[PDB]
Amino acid sequence: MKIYVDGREVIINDNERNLLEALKNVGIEIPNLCYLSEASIYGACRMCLVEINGQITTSCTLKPYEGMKVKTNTPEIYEMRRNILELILATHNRDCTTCDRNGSCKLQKYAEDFGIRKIRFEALKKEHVRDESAPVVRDTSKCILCGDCVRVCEEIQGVGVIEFAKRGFESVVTTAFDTPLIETECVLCGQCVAYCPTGALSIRNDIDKLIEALESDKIVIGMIAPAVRAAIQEEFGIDEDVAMAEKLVSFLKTIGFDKVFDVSFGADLVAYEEAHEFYERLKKGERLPQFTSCCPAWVKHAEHTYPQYLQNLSSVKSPQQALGTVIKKIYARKLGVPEEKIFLVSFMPCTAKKFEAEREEHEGIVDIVLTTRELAQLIKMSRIDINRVEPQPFDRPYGVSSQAGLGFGKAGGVFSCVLSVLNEEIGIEKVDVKSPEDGIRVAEVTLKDGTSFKGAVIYGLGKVKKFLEERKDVEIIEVMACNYGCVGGGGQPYPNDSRIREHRAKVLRDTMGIKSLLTPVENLFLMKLYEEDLKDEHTRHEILHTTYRPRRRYPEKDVEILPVPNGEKRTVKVCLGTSCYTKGSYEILKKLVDYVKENDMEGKIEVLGTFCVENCGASPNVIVDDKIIGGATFEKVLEELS
Amino acid sequence: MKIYVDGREVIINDNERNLLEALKNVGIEIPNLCYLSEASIYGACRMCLVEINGQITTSCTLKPYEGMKVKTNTPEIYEMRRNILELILATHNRDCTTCDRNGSCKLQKYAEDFGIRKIRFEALKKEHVRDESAPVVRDTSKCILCGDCVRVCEEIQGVGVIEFAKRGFESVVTTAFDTPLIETECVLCGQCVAYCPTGALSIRNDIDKLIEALESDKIVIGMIAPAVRAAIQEEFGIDEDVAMAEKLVSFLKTIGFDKVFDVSFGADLVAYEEAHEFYERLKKGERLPQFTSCCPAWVKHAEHTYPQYLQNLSSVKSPQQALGTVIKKIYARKLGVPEEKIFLVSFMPCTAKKFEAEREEHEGIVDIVLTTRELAQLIKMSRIDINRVEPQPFDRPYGVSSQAGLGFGKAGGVFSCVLSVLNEEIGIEKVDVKSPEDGIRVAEVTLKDGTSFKGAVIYGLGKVKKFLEERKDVEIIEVMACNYGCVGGGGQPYPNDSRIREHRAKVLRDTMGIKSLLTPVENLFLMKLYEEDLKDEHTRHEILHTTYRPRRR
Amino acid sequence: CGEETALLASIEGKRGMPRPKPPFPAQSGLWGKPTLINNVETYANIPRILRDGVENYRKRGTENSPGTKMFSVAGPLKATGIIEVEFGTTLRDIIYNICGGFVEGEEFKAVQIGGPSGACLSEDFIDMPLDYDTLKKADAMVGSGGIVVITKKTCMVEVARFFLDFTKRESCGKCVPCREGTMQAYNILEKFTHGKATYEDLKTLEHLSKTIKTASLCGLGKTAPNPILSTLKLFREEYIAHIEGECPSGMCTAFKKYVINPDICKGCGLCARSCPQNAITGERGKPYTIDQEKCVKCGLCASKCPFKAIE
Numbered sequence A: 001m002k003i004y005v006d007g008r009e010v011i012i013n014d015n016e017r018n019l020l021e022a023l024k025n026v027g028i029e030i031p032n033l034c035y036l037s038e039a040s041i042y043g044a045c046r047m048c049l050v051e052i053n054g055q056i057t058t059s060c061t062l063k064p065y066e067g068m069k070v071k072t073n074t075p076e077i078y079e080m081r082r083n084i085l086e087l088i089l090a091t092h093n094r095d096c097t098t099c100d101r102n103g104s105c106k107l108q109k110y111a112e113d114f115g116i117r118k119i120r121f122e123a124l125k126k127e128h129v130r131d132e133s134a135p136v137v138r139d140t141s142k143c144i145l146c147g148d149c150v151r152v153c154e155e156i157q158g159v160g161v162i163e164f165a166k167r168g169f170e171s172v173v174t175t176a177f178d179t180p181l182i183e184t185e186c187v188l189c190g191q192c193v194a195y196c197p198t199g200a201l202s203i204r205n206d207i208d209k210l211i212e213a214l215e216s217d218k219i220v221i222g223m224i225a226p227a228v229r230a231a232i233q234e235e236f237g238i239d240e241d242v243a244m245a246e247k248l249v250s251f252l253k254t255i256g257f258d259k260v261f262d263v264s265f266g267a268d269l270v271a272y273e274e275a276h277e278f279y280e281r282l283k284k285g286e287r288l289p290q291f292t293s294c295c296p297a298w299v300k301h302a303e304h305t306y307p308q309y310l311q312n313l314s315s316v317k318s319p320q321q322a323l324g325t326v327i328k329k330i331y332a333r334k335l336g337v338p339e340e341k342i343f344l345v346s347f348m349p350c351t352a353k354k355f356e357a358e359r360e361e362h363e364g365i366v367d368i369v370l371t372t373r374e375l376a377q378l379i380k381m382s383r384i385d386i387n388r389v390e391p392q393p394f395d396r397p398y399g400v401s402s403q404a405g406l407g408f409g410k411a412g413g414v415f416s417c418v419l420s421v422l423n424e425e426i427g428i429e430k431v432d433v434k435s436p437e438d439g440i441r442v443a444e445v446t447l448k449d450g451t452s453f454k455g456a457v458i459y460g461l462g463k464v465k466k467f468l469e470e471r472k473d474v475e476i477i478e479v480m481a482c483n484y485g486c487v488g489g490g491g492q493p494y495p496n497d498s499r500i501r502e503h504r505a506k507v508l509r510d511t512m513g514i515k516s517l518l519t520p521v522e523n524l525f526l527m528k529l530y531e532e533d534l535k536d537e538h539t540r541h542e543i544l545h546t547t548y549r550p551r552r553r554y555p556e557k558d559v560e561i562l563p564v565p566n567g568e569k570r571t572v573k574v575c576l577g578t579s580c581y582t583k584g585s586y587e588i589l590k591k592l593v594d595y596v597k598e599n600d601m602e603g604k605i606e607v608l609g610t611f612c613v614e615n616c617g618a619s620p621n622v623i624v625d626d627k628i629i630g631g632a633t634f635e636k637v638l639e640e641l642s
Numbered sequence B: 001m002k003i004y005v006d007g008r009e010v011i012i013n014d015n016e017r018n019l020l021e022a023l024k025n026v027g028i029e030i031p032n033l034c035y036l037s038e039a040s041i042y043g044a045c046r047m048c049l050v051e052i053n054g055q056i057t058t059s060c061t062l063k064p065y066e067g068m069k070v071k072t073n074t075p076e077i078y079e080m081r082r083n084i085l086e087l088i089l090a091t092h093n094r095d096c097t098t099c100d101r102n103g104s105c106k107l108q109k110y111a112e113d114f115g116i117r118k119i120r121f122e123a124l125k126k127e128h129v130r131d132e133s134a135p136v137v138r139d140t141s142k143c144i145l146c147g148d149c150v151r152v153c154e155e156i157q158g159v160g161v162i163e164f165a166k167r168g169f170e171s172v173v174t175t176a177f178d179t180p181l182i183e184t185e186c187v188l189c190g191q192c193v194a195y196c197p198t199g200a201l202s203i204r205n206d207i208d209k210l211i212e213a214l215e216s217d218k219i220v221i222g223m224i225a226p227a228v229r230a231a232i233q234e235e236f237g238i239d240e241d242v243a244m245a246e247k248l249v250s251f252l253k254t255i256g257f258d259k260v261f262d263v264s265f266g267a268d269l270v271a272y273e274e275a276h277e278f279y280e281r282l283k284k285g286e287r288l289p290q291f292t293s294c295c296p297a298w299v300k301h302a303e304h305t306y307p308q309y310l311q312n313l314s315s316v317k318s319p320q321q322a323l324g325t326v327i328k329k330i331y332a333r334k335l336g337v338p339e340e341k342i343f344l345v346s347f348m349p350c351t352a353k354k355f356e357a358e359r360e361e362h363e364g365i366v367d368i369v370l371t372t373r374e375l376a377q378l379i380k381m382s383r384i385d386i387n388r389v390e391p392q393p394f395d396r397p398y399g400v401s402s403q404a405g406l407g408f409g410k411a412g413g414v415f416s417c418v419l420s421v422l423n424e425e426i427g428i429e430k431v432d433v434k435s436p437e438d439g440i441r442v443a444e445v446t447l448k449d450g451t452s453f454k455g456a457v458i459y460g461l462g463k464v465k466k467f468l469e470e471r472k473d474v475e476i477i478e479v480m481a482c483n484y485g486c487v488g489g490g491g492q493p494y495p496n497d498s499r500i501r502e503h504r505a506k507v508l509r510d511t512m513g514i515k516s517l518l519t520p521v522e523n524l525f526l527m528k529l530y531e532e533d534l535k536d537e538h539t540r541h542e543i544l545h546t547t548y549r550p551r552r553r
Numbered sequence C: 001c002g003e004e005t006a007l008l009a010s011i012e013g014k015r016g017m018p019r020p021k022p023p024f025p026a027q028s029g030l031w032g033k034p035t036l037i038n039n040v041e042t043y044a045n046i047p048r049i050l051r052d053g054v055e056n057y058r059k060r061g062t063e064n065s066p067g068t069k070m071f072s073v074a075g076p077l078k079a080t081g082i083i084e085v086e087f088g089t090t091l092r093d094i095i096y097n098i099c100g101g102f103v104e105g106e107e108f109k110a111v112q113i114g115g116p117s118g119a120c121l122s123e124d125f126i127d128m129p130l131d132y133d134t135l136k137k138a139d140a141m142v143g144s145g146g147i148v149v150i151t152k153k154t155c156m157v158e159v160a161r162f163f164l165d166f167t168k169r170e171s172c173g174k175c176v177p178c179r180e181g182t183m184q185a186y187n188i189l190e191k192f193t194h195g196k197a198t199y200e201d202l203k204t205l206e207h208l209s210k211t212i213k214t215a216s217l218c219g220l221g222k223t224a225p226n227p228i229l230s231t232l233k234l235f236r237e238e239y240i241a242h243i244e245g246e247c248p249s250g251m252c253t254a255f256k257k258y259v260i261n262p263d264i265c266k267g268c269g270l271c272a273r274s275c276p277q278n279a280i281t282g283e284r285g286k287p288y289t290i291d292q293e294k295c296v297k298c299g300l301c302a303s304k305c306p307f308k309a310i311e
C-alpha cells in the first residue's frame, strides 16, 4: 500500500489498523498524547489531526487505503494542536521541579517543543484529590485522564480499585467516594504508577528519613533485593552490568552504611523454610494447595478476596522480613548492641514492600524501604560515576547467597528454589513444565520415593481468579502480583514496559549464571545460622513465621449533620430512608437540630443521620447510643438522651 | 599532586585554582550551581561542600595540596546539599511547562536528581518583577541571583543596564528603578539571555502571530538569515548540514509559506550600496570614519552613547530591512497585489532585529521576526525529521547570493563584502590585516588608483569605547554587538559559549565554500534589480536609506 | 559592612558584598594593596601599651587575655552604661556589683553578650571569668563587647525571632544559605511565636540552623543561627511550651489575641469545656466567636481543637 504524505511517495505496509501506527512504523511521527504506555488506547487526545480530501480528522482512527493523499501539517492543524496543548496545560498542575515525572514526561517535552510560554486560557480550579495515605501517592491535579491506570488496575491486575468518576470538567480518576487508597482493596502493586505517564501517580519518597538516620548515631544496615541490581543500571543510561550489587555496596558504604547485606540470603533462608513446610503439608495432605507469601501484594489480595485460603498461605514471611528479623533479633545480640541502635534500610523494587514493612505483624523490624528509583536518586545526588566505582563484596555473614536465592527476582524464582531444596533433600525424578497461558506455568514433579505433586507459577495478578476457579489439581502455587515477577515491580525505573522487563530478567539470569553454589544448603553461612541460632523450633517459629488476618471494609459513612470530632457524646442517628421518611423522620430531625441549636453548647450531643436500619414498618427509627428505639419522636429521643 | 577522594588514589594537575576544577578535569564531578556559563564565578551556591581535616568547606575556594583526604559525599554533606537545593526551590517559580529553559535547566535537573518531591520550607512571598515591554523578557521569579547576566552586560557588552539591587531576601537583579527595559539604554543584544541559566531572562515568543498569519488569507513570505542556517542543527542534536537552508525552505513551504527568500540577497544589496557610499565619502572625505549600520544593537548603542557619530553611520538600512522594503515595494507591485496582502516573516539569529522591525523608521515592512530557537520550535512541533527532508532552492528572484553576502553571519562579513565590491569596481592592491587584540582587527587597504585607508572590524560591544578613544586613524569601523558576530546572537540556540560560536562560524564558512558566485556584481538578480527598479537615485534613497536620531531619557 | 571584605568594598564606593578569603585583606585589600584592619578599641589599646611596658600592661587581665575590655550594659538594671572591666571578671560581678543589680520587680533569666553573633547565657554561666579562650571552650564568646540582661518577663523564643529578623534584614543576599535560610528560619520562628508551630518545625529549625552555620560564605551567615542554637540548648522547655501551648512568660500572649477563624470552623462543641470564663457562646453548626471581654489568654482552646482554628 503506497500513500502520499505532504506530497511525497511513501510505502507504509500491506495491512495496518490506522494511519498513525502505519506512519510510525515507517518512521513518520505525528504528535499525540494517546500512546503513553502499553495500556494506552487511541481517541482521547485528538492531537493526531491530519487533512484528507479537505476535511481534518484523527489519524489514529483512519484506515489507510491505497493512493490516499494526507497532509500532516497545515496551519489549521498547527493552530488546533497548539490549542489542544494549551487546554491541557491550562488546568494542569505545572510544578515540574517537585514532580516525579520530571525529565521523563511527554507533556513536559511537548510544552517545551510547542514553545508554550503563556497560558491564554484561565487556570480554572477543580475539586482535585491529594491522597498520600499509602506508599502509592495520588495527585489528580497532574492527571491528563488518559485512563491507562484504570485499564492497568482492571484488565491487568484484576483489582479495579480506581475508576473514572463524574463527567465533564469534574471528570477524575479516583477511588470510590474518594476513599484513601490505604483503606481500599488496593494491593499496592504499583503497576498503575509504573504505567502512569504523569506525576499523578507516584511513589512516596522517603530519602529524607534515610539521610536523617545516616546523620544520627545509629548503626545503619542496608540490604539489597535481587531485582534491584538487575534494573538500577537503566537510570544512568548504561547497559547491563553484573557486579552491580557490589559497586552498589561500595557506594552505600561510602555514604555511611555500616553493613550492607544481600536479601538473596534471606531468600535462600525463606526457600529452605518453605520447602520443609510444604513437605510436611504434603506428607500430611492438609492445607493444600499451598500459596507462597513472598509477594506482599498477593498476600493483601488474598486477605481481601480469599479469607478461606488464608490458612493455605505459607506461614514463612517474605525474604525482606525474614532477613530483617534475623538481623534485629540475632545480629544485634552477636554484636552486643541494643536493637534500638540499628536502623534497617531495605532497597526493594516493590511499592508493596513499603506496606509490608509497616504491617502490624512486622512493626519495628524494617525502618524504611526505598525503591530502586530512590536508590538511583541517592546515587545521582553524589554525582559519582557508579560505572567507575570499584565493586566490593557484601558484608558477612548475610552477604553470600545461592543462585536459587538470587532467582527470586523474577517469576518462577521461589518455586525453582523450593524445587532445588527438595531435590537436594529428596531427589526429583523429573519435572514436566506446561504453559497453559502466557503468564501461567504448571510443573509436574515426581520425587524419588514416588510422591508427586503439581506446582503452578502465576505472575501478574488478575490471572489468579480463573486459575483458582477452574484448577484444583495443584498442591503449591506461586503468585507474583507484577508481570515477569519483581523485575517489573512498581518501584522499578521508568519506563517499565514488557521489553524492559524481559531485558531485566535476562540481566538477572546472567547475574545468576556466575554464582558457584547452586542451592541454599550449599550456602554455609545459612547452615551456620541454623546451627547456632535457629536450632530449636520455638525460636525458628518466632523468627521466620507470621500470621495473616482477613480484611473487610468497616465503613459507617453515615450522614454528618452536626458531627463531634471526638469526646464522650450520645451519637444520635436518625433514619433517613423512604419508609421512615414517610412519617415524621425529617421533621423529628429538624426538632433535634433546633434542640441542639438552643441546647447542647458543647459536643455532648451529635445529631447524625443514617440510612435504613432494617426496622421498617415500625415507625420512624432514631438510633441512641447504638440502641434501637422504634416509634421515635422528639420527646422519646429526649428521654432516652436523659 | 597526589590527593585522596573518598579514600582512594586520584591524580590531579599541579597548578589548579581550586579543588573543584581539579576534580572536574580529572573526572570527579561535584554538584554545584555556580559554574553555569562563561561569565560564571564561584562562592555563591555553597553546594560544593567537602570534608577536609574534619571541617566542612567549599571545594571551589579550596587550594589543593599534596596528600589531602577529602570526603566528597557524607551524610552531613548530603543533608546540607539537599537543604540548599530546597531553599532555592522554595522561593523559585516552579512552573517549567511555560519556561524557555525547560529541558536545558540545571536547577530542573538537580530537582529531578535530588528527589525533591515536597518543600517543607514555606513559599515566602517576594516582590517579583515581570517585564514584557521589550523583545528581551524579564522574570525575576525564576532568578537564582547567580549574577552571570550582570557580568555579561557590564564586562562583555559594556552597557551595564542590569545590576543587583536591594539586599538580603529582597536581593533582585533589575534595572535602575525597575524601569522597563525598552525605556533604558539596553541595546537588546540578548547576550544576557544567551548566558542566563534559568527562565529569568527569555526572548519574546511570537509563534502565535505566525500561525495566525499562516491560517489567514495573506501571502506569507519568509526570509532566512545567513547565520540561522549555521546553528539550527544544534536544536535537533544532529550534525551540521551544508544544505540546511534548502531543507528549511522545503519545510516552510510545507507548512504554508508562499515564498521563501535568502537574506543573503539583502546582504549583497546592502554591501553594494554601502561600498558605493563609502567610496564617495573617501573621494570627498566627509563624515569619516564611516560606521556600519547592519547591527541594530550597535545602532541603538550609538544613538544612546555617541550622538555625535549619528551622521557618521551608514545611511543604508540593514539587510533585513533592505530586503523587506524591496519585497513590499517592488515584488508586491510586480505581482499585482496590495502590500497589505503580504505578511513578511523574518528568521534571524538576533533579538535586536525584533526591535529594528518595530522601529518607527521601518514600521510596517517586516511583520514579525522569529529567532533561530522559534524556527526550531516550529520544526519540533511538526515532528518532521528535518534531516530526511528533500532540499529545494530559495524562491526567485531573491533566492541566490554570493559568498560575501552569506558571510554577514559572522564578524567581518560586511567589511569583507564591501572590500570585495571595491575590488570589483575599484581594484585593491594589498590588504594588511592586523589583530591588535581578540575582538579587534585593523586592516590597511590600498586601492589601485588612489590612496589607502584603514578598516577596523570590532565584534563584541564594549571594545568599541576603548577602540574609539585610543584609535583616531581608521576610515571605516565595523561593529558587531555579539562576540563572533551574528553566529553568537542572543536568539541562537542554547547553550552558546565560545566553542559553540566557533563551530557555528566554521559551519558558515563551509556553507560559503560551496557557493559559485563570489561577488555581488556577479549576482545577476541584484544587477537586474538595480537596472529595473532602483535605477533612479531618488528611488534608491527612498528604498535603501534610513535615518537615525539621538536617544536621551 | 563589619565584615572585612565587605568593609573594604564599601570603602571603595561599591556594594558591601563580602567575598571568599583566599586573598586575605592583609595581603590584598583596598584596590589590591595590603590593608591592615582593626577595631577602634585595639587602636586605643596600642598607645596605652607603648606608653607602658609589656609586663606593666599584662599586670591586669589573664595570661591569654591580657588587658581590659570596654563593655556596654543595657537592660533593666539600677545603672546601665559603658563599663571597663579587666579580663577575667565574671558576668555576675558585672551585673550585680558594677551595675548594681536589677530594678525592683525584675529578675535574671539570661544575658546576651555579642548580639546576633554572640550567644545566650543562663544562671549557670553567670559566674564564670570572661576570657576569649574560656568562652570559646564554654560554647560562647566574648562578643564585640555589648551586654544586655534578659529578665523573666521576656520570652527567649521572641529573642531568637528578633535576632533572626535582624539578620534576615541585614543579609547581603550573596550566598544561598544565608539569604534563604535566614528568611526561612525567621518564618519558622514567627510560626513559633504565633502558636502555629509543631515538632516537625523544631526539627526543621535545628537542621536548617546547622546548614546555615556550616555553609554560609561569611561570618554574618555563619553566626546567624547562634541565637537559635544557644536559646534552644538552654530553653528547649520554653520551645516545647510554645509548641504545645502558650508563652510561659506571656510576652508573646501579653500583647496578642485569640480569634476564631470562621473560614475553617464548623461550630462543633469543645472550647467551652475548658474555658473557665465561658468566652465562647457560639452558634451551633456555625462558626464560633471568642469573647475577648473575659479572655484571660489562658490558651486552652488551641491546646485541643481538632480543626485548628484558634488563631
Ligand SMILES: Cc1cc2nc3c(=O)[nH]c(=O)nc-3n(C[C@H](O)[C@H](O)[C@H](O)COP(=O)(O)O)c2cc1C
Binding pocket: C001, C002, C003, C004, C037, C038, C039, C040, C042, C218, C219, C220
Ligand atoms: C557580621 C559581622 C560584623 C562585624 N562587625 C564588626 C564591627 O562592627 N567592628 C569590628 O571591629 N569588627 C567587626 N567584625 C569583625 C571583622 O569581620 C574582622 O574580624 C575584623 O577585622 C576584626 O578586627 P579586630 O582584629 O580589631 O578585632 C564583624 C564581623 C562580622 C562577620
Ligand code: SF4
Binding pocket: A092, A093, A094, A095, A096, A099, A100, A101, A102, A103, A105, A106, A107, A108, A142, A197, A198, A199, A200, B096, B097
Ligand atoms: S506531569 Fe509533572 S513533569 Fe509532566 S508537565 Fe506535569 S508537573 Fe511537569
Ligand code: SF4
Binding pocket: A136, A152, A153, A157, A159, A160, A161, A162, A185, A186, A187, A188, A189, A190, A191, A192, A193
Ligand atoms: S497499586 Fe495496583 S491495585 Fe493499587 S490502584 Fe495501582 S494498579 Fe490498582
Ligand code: SF4
Binding pocket: A142, A143, A144, A145, A146, A147, A148, A149, A150, A173, A192, A195, A196, A197, A198, A200, A201
Ligand atoms: S492517573 Fe496517570 S495513568 Fe491514570 S488517567 Fe491520570 S495520567 Fe493517566
Ligand code: SF4
Binding pocket: A188, A189, A294, A295, A296, A297, A298, A349, A350, A351, A352, A353, A480, A481, A482, A485, A486, A487, A488, A489, A490
Ligand atoms: S511481584 Fe515482586 S515487585 Fe510485584 S508486588 Fe510482588 S513482591 Fe512487589
Ligand code: SF4
Binding pocket: A096, A097, B092, B093, B094, B095, B096, B099, B100, B101, B102, B103, B105, B106, B107, B108, B142, B197, B198, B199, B200
Ligand atoms: S528555570 Fe524554568 S525550567 Fe528551570 S526549574 Fe525554574 S521554571 Fe523550571
Ligand code: SF4
Binding pocket: B136, B152, B153, B157, B159, B160, B161, B162, B185, B186, B187, B188, B189, B190, B191, B192, B193
Ligand atoms: S540585551 Fe544586552 S544590553 Fe540589554 S540587558 Fe541584556 S546584555 Fe545588557
Ligand code: SF4
Binding pocket: B142, B143, B144, B145, B146, B147, B148, B149, B150, B173, B195, B196, B197, B198, B200, B201
Ligand atoms: S537573571 Fe539569569 S543570569 Fe541573571 S542572575 Fe538571574 S539567573 Fe543569573
Ligand code: SF4
Binding pocket: B188, B189, B294, B295, B296, B297, B298, B349, B350, B351, B352, B353, B480, B481, B482, B485, B486, B487, B488, B489, B490
Ligand atoms: S551582531 Fe548580529 S546577532 Fe548580535 S546584535 Fe548585531 S545583528 Fe544581532
Ligand code: SF4
Binding pocket: C018, C170, C171, C172, C173, C174, C175, C176, C178, C179, C216, C217, C218, C219, C220, C221, C222
Ligand atoms: S553569609 Fe549572608 S552576609 Fe555573608 S555573604 Fe552570604 S548572604 Fe552575604
Ligand code: SF4
Binding pocket: C260, C264, C265, C266, C267, C268, C269, C270, C271, C288, C304, C305, C306, C307, C308, C309, C310
Ligand atoms: S473546637 Fe475548634 S472547630 Fe470546634 S467550635 Fe471550637 S474553634 Fe470551632
Ligand code: SF4
Binding pocket: C258, C274, C275, C276, C277, C278, C279, C280, C290, C291, C294, C295, C296, C297, C298, C299, C300, C301
Ligand atoms: S484563651 Fe482561655 S480564657 Fe480565652 S477564650 Fe480561650 S479558654 Fe477562655
Ligand code: FES
Binding pocket: A020, A032, A033, A034, A035, A042, A043, A044, A045, A046, A047, A048, A058, A059, A060, A061
Ligand atoms: S492519537 Fe490521540 S486522538 Fe488520535
Ligand code: FES
Binding pocket: A575, A576, A577, A578, A579, A580, A581, A611, A612, A613, A614, A615, A616, A621
Ligand atoms: S427506612 Fe428507616 S428502618 Fe428502613
Ligand code: FES
Binding pocket: B020, B032, B033, B034, B035, B042, B043, B044, B045, B046, B047, B048, B058, B059, B060, B061
Ligand atoms: S561551586 Fe558554588 S559555592 Fe562552590
Ligand SMILES: [Zn+2]
Binding pocket: C155, C156, C157, C158, C193, C242, C246, C247, C248, C249, C250, C251, C252, C253
Ligand atoms: Zn513566647
